[PDB]
Amino acid sequence: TRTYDGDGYKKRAACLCFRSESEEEVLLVSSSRHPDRWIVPGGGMEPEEEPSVAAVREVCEEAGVKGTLGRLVGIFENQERKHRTYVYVLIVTEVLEDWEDSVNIGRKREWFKIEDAIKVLQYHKPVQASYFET
Ligand SMILES: O=P(O)(O)O[C@H]1[C@H](OP(=O)(O)O)[C@@H](OP(=O)(O)O)[C@H](OP(=O)(O)O)[C@@H](OP(=O)(O)O)[C@H]1OP(=O)(O)O
Ligand SMILES: [Cl-]
Ligand SMILES: [Cl-]
Ligand SMILES: [Mg+2]
């Protein structure tokens, strides 16, 4: 069940999944529609679901990782697609081998240096590239 802010923007949560507290390498996942493209893992909040809980759930489902939830980075809008995403830091401590989206749609995941994550996100997901700006 999709959820929405009062202005009709779809509510989402996502994590920047870092390998370590150094925050030098981040986990991206393949686009569901275009698997040769990379995205930051995330998705819709469920009814009455805390944003931090949604963020952790979505990265388990999409990226097959768990870890230590860190700070809220910020709340980011995509004007064209009308969605608003809470973006958290997650320090990955567990990497699972056969996660929901790997099994269901063959979703891929890969570690990127921050500068390379920004590069591959820029063309189709410039708002996601902007998560890393600070
Ligand atoms: O841009 P929207 O209209 O909100 O639609 C998006 C988009 O799907 P499209 O392929 O239809 O543009 C995402 O696909 P990608 O970012 O992977 O290319 C998809 O993401 P995922 O399948 O990766 O989860 C996302 O879902 P979400 O916001 O839950 O991450 C889905 O929105 P819906 O699930 O609400 O249709
Ligand atoms: Cl790191
Ligand atoms: Cl976006
Ligand atoms: Mg998603």
How would you describe what is shown here?
23% of the residues lie in helices and 39% in strands. By secondary structure, the chain is of the alpha+beta class. It has one domain (1-134). The strands form two sheets. A four-stranded mixed sheet has the order 4-1-6-5, with helices on one face. A three-stranded antiparallel sheet has the order 3-2-7. Strand 5 and strand 6 (83-95) form a beta hairpin. The chain is globular. Inositol hexakisphosphate binds at residues 2, 10, 12, 31-34, 39, 42-44, 81, 83. Its EC number is 3.6.1.52, 3.6.1.61, 3.6.1.10, 3.6.1.62. Its cofactor is Mg(2+); Mn(2+); Zn(2+). Mg(2+) 3 binds at residue 58.
Strand content range? 35-45%
User: Strand pairing plus helix content: what structural class?
Assistant: alpha+beta
Give the radius of gyration: 14 Å
Order of helices and strands: EEEEHEEHEHH
The major beta sheet can be summarized as:
4 strands, mixed
How far apart, in Å, are the first and last alpha carbons?
32 Å
Bound molecules: inositol hexakisphosphate, chloride ion, magnesium ion
Q: What is the strand tally?
A: 7
Give the CA-based shape.
Answer: globular
List the domain count as a whole number: 1
Task: Bin the helical content.
Answer: 10-25%
Number of helices: 4
* Major beta sheet, strand line-up: 4-1-6-5
PDB class: hydrolase
Keywords: phosphatase, nudix, catalysis mechanism, Substrate Specificity, inositol, inositol pyrophosphate, hydrolase
Assembly: monomeric
Entry title: Diphosphoinositol polyphosphate phosphohydrolase 1 (DIPP1/NUDT3) in complex with inositol hexakisphosphate and Mg, presoaked with 5-IP7, Mg and Fluoride, soaking 2min in the absence of Fluoride.
